[PDB]
Amino acid sequence: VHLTPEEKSAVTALWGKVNVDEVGGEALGRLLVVYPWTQRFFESFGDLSTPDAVMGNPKVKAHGKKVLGAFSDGLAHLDNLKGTFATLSELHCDKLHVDPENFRLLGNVLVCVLAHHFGKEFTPPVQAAYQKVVAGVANALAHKYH
Amino acid sequence: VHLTPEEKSAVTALWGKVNVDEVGGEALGRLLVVYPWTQRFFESFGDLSTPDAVMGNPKVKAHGKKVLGAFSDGLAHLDNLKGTFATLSELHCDKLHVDPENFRLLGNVLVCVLAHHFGKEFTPPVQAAYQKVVAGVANALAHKYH
Amino acid sequence: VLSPADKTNVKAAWGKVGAHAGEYGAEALERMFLSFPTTKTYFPHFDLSHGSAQVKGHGKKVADALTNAVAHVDDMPNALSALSDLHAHKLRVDPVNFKLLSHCLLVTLAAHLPAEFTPAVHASLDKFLASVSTVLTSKYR
Amino acid sequence: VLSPADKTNVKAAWGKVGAHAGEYGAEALERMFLSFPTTKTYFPHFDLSHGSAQVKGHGKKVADALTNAVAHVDDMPNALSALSDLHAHKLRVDPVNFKLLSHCLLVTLAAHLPAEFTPAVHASLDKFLASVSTVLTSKYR
């Protein structure tokens, strides 16, 4: 991605301050809460009936950190999200049947979680760079769909 | 635009049969009739008050022909949409201020127009190839926006 | 909102569709699967091969539902509430997908009703499908 | 479809914005222009520069229409007809842009009302901006 270096530097720096555990559970929980139809893939997590039920859910929370974990590595390969997510791309496609529109929804949730977290520091320009990242990630993850 | 070769012959084969002049006036007039907010760019074209005012409007027809002619030339450079359309990209951005979403609408209208014209001949796989082409052209046109 | 003309346009084009509705439904779905392959993630359980009976069977179902919305053009929220419930709560199809099928249905009709598929009818039809899609996703959250 | 909780949720959130609403409006615009540069095609006559007086001016107007929608949660259509008219017949902003500006306002709120920007509140505001978007684009065709 057409991340500019001041852009790439901007991403990297905030990212470094991220508690993946927490940001990953928060991101996945908020997705399930704001866009309830995304719950369709997580029936097995249990109870998602309420925002508290969702936010509290340990596996939502454990799947949130694993998803952010994977995201976090892609940030090492910004250069190449595509080859960095190819296998995850096929997986999401061939085994999980996840519509890639979900990746977009998670991306935007993530940006809201980061602003929430970093307030002040998650400036328009830093948001612009992350927007480009989350869009890049969604595209690399959707790339192997067929 | 990464099209199978099988996808570009298909594209190329059909295209071979289009009357650009006429299809260009039809796709542009339909755009303005079906998505009337797109009339915002053509105040100077006169009367777009009704479907016949739009469709038979000689400036709509004349513009339709230049738009499709430009599209028509992109079809010869599938390999390099983005270079092919860069100066048009910048013009639409810097001078005309066209939101690139308009390029996507026109691409869909265009697909409906080819279907209307070719009927049965516009098969599902021929449509899938044109879907990639018009998406490729909208992306090339949106490429230099900033 | 659907104007009187829109409604006239839609009853007219849908009238002509007539007996073919199912076959157009099944073709609209194939078009969709082919042009927007991500829509296939919702039909992992279907035979999505050309001429798949699951597809032919599903196309009629979709075509019947649209015929029913046309039949109740003045009460679609209610005519389709069961299908809104279905899609909201069980299927959970992301909303963007409705636009993709709408578009492939418009293409299908264009491909089959050249004399009817005029600019004004095309305008009415798109507004109709957008209305049906809005109805189907109205209970999502 | 704004539930009772939603409305209470937005009234709350909106309630804490209070005199910073014009500020958050201008910030939300700024974020949109930087994150989604295509949105700038609607403001060629604006000085889109950082802390531009037009951008601040506009931020306020938009912030004031949201406040009004919040006050009239119950009767948006009405509360905002002038504004749907305006956007439908004069501005003619493409409807995809409403999603971008709504996102930028959610991001603006979260960044500033972290306590209050709860998963539930967040869900409520998203639905809220979505229906405002809907109202504003209802008369387009």
Ligand code: HEM
């Ligand atoms: C946005 C970036 C995403 C990344 C980097 C990502 C990454 C991952 C990873 C690393 C796994 C574990 C794969 C495995 O080891 O089996 C996984 C599994 C999974 N993901 Fe994604 N994912 C993303 C988004 C999403 C979204 C938005 C959804 C649906 C709302 C989703 C649905 C799933 C499901 C249902 C599984 C299987 C969970 C299980 O095994 O129970 N993913 N994902």
Ligand code: HEM
């Ligand atoms: C396939 C996509 C398109 C292509 C290849 C295309 C191509 C062209 C060309 C060749 C010109 C003339 C350039 C010049 O004057 O120097 C032009 C002008 C223009 N285009 Fe596009 N265009 C496309 C889509 C659109 C759409 C969808 C809209 C808005 C709905 C639009 C709005 C305009 C306007 C407003 C003008 C200037 C007309 C005038 O006052 O002379 N274009 N375009």
Ligand code: HEM
């Ligand atoms: C306005 C457009 C649509 C109409 C009228 C429609 C109508 C229907 C109908 C009548 C059914 C069968 C429910 C039953 O068993 O009675 C159904 C099921 C279903 N629909 Fe929709 N639908 C639409 C849009 C979509 C879209 C865009 C998608 C995904 C891309 C989708 C995915 C599904 C799936 C996966 C099922 C169940 C199929 C099965 O397991 O048999 N629908 N729909």
Ligand code: HEM
């Ligand atoms: C959240 C939804 C929105 C609200 C509440 C809103 C509200 C408003 C308000 C209050 C005005 C000033 C009207 C007056 O002069 O009295 C306005 C004008 C305007 N809006 Fe919207 N708007 C929204 C979405 C958008 C979007 C998404 C865009 C485009 C990216 C847009 C573009 C414009 C433009 C170009 C003007 C005219 C500005 C000028 O020339 O001064 N609006 N809107």
Ligand SMILES: O=P(O)(O)O[C@H]1[C@H](OP(=O)(O)O)[C@@H](OP(=O)(O)O)[C@H](OP(=O)(O)O)[C@@H](OP(=O)(O)O)[C@H]1OP(=O)(O)O
């Ligand atoms: O970032 P952009 O300049 O907008 O273009 C990138 C990509 O380039 P990279 O692989 O170098 O990031 C490709 O553009 P071209 O090389 O064809 O110009 C193309 O990706 P595909 O090869 O997968 O098509 C796609 O642009 P578009 O969709 O406009 O064709 C887009 O990739 P992303 O959207 O995944 O960033």
